[PDB]
Design a protein around this ligand. Structure first.
Ligand SMILES: Cc1cc2nc3c(=O)[nH]c(=O)nc-3n(C[C@H](O)[C@H](O)[C@H](O)COP(=O)(O)O)c2cc1C
Length: 351
């Protein structure tokens, strides 16, 4: 009866409902290695046939832009992940691992040998934020990527995808949003390259295209999706003509024909003509609740609805949205803290 709870076929996976657990970086993967808590954490949010997206997970030793966010690049990371995946599968969930690389959203302390964070440009991020009595910005200014190192980075993503297929994930979500490394190449206020990877919408999207192209052939197109936020400017990631990206992108992806397009809502033409344009599954996130999502589902506005903070604080959200029940509050101060339990797995189930 409830739209959000109506089944939906995606690529070839049977979803029991459309309430998707949004990828959520929790910074509790000590040393970049997934922890035992995640096993509980993701398991608690799994439902027979529920779709789950992992927190962003580094592809390499330079992909990070924070601390303790999991990587998917060392044999070790994989074994830490493996059991987390089994617990999700033993409960029936379709579990995708989002894959990123922060790009210019990092610092020397994050990079090995203290090297500088890398990006499509040498454009500094948040210059007003300085340390203590120094000049060294919070975000170590980015080194403009040698155009010879770019095809390799594109290979870093294809690899992590293959590794996902090794840890047993059903596929991967390419992080193409939120001021991260891929969004940087796409955004004009950030991408000012004068070679083949910048200087125009064409050259700018070349990066994410080579990714949607490589990952797809690697693990199959119908198992690959990508997340984009053409309206957001998180981490000074605004584009001079964002409204256009949504559409363009929506169409540019059909060409490569992949599993789904996952887009974040704007500060409110936006996502309607987007799901209309994309031939495959369309997932909505950013602003949803009950009706918000129900409306988007029933009125054919979206195929799925990914919840972030509301799913973080309610292991049993899909059932609620089915069994008319209110929700618990999310604890902001602990979303990013590092306790294995507190604010991570102590959010209670209904009854
Ligand atoms: C603690 C936290 C971590 C997040 N981590 C990620 C992430 O790793 N990748 C991503 O694409 N989005 C991430 N997001 C954003 C969620 O995917 C997004 O908040 C959610 O879909 C927004 O729901 P709200 O605006 O609709 O109500 C994160 C959000 C929060 C609060």
């Amino acid at each position: 009866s409830v739209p959000l709870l109506t089944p939906y076929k995606m690529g070839r996976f049977n979803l029991s409902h459309r309430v998707v657990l949004a990828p959520l970086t929790r910074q509790r993967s000590y040393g970049n290695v997934p922890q035992p808590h995640a096993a509980i954490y993701y398991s608690q949010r799994t439902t027979p046939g529920g779709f789950l997206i992992t927190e962003a997970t580094g592809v390499s030793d330079t992909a990070q832009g924070y601390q303790d966010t999991p990587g998917i690049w060392t044999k070790e990371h994989v074994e830490a992940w493996k059991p987390i995946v089994d617990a999700v599968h033993a409960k029936g969930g379709i579990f995708f691992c989002q894959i990123w690389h922060v790009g210019r959203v990092s610092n020397s302390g994050f990079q090995p040998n203290g090297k500088a964070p890398i990006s499509c440009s040498d454009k500094p991020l948040m210059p007003q934020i300085r340390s203590n009595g120094i000049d060294e910005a919070l975000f170590t200014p980015p080194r403009r990527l040698g155009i010879e190192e770019i095809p390799g980075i594109v290979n870093d993503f294809r690899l992590a995808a293959r590794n996902a297929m090794e840890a047993g994930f059903d596929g991967v979500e390419i992080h193409g949003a939120n001021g991260y490394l891929i969004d940087q190449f796409m955004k004009d206020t950030v991408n000012d390259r004068t070679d083949e990877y910048g200087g125009s919408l064409q050259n700018r999207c070349k990066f994410p295209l080579e990714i949607v192209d490589a990952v797809a052939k690697e693990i199959g197109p119908d198992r690959v999706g990508i997340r984009l936020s053409p309206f957001a400017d998180y981490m000074e990631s605004g584009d001079t003509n964002p409204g256009a990206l949504g559409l363009y992108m929506a169409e540019s992806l059909n060409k490569y024909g992949i599993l789904y397009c996952h887009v974040i809502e704007a500060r409110m033409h936006t996502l309607m003509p987007m799901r209309k344009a994309f031939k495959g599954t369309f997932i909505s996130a950013g602003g949803f609740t009950r009706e918000d999502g129900n409306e988007a589902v029933s009125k054919g506005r979206t195929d799925l609805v990914a919840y972030g903070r509301w799913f973080l604080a309610n292991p049993d959200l899909p059932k609620r949205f089915q069994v008319d029940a209110p929700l618990n509050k999310y604890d902001r101060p602990t979303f990013y803290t590092s306790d294995p339990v507190v604010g991570y797995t102590d959010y209670p189930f209904l009854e």
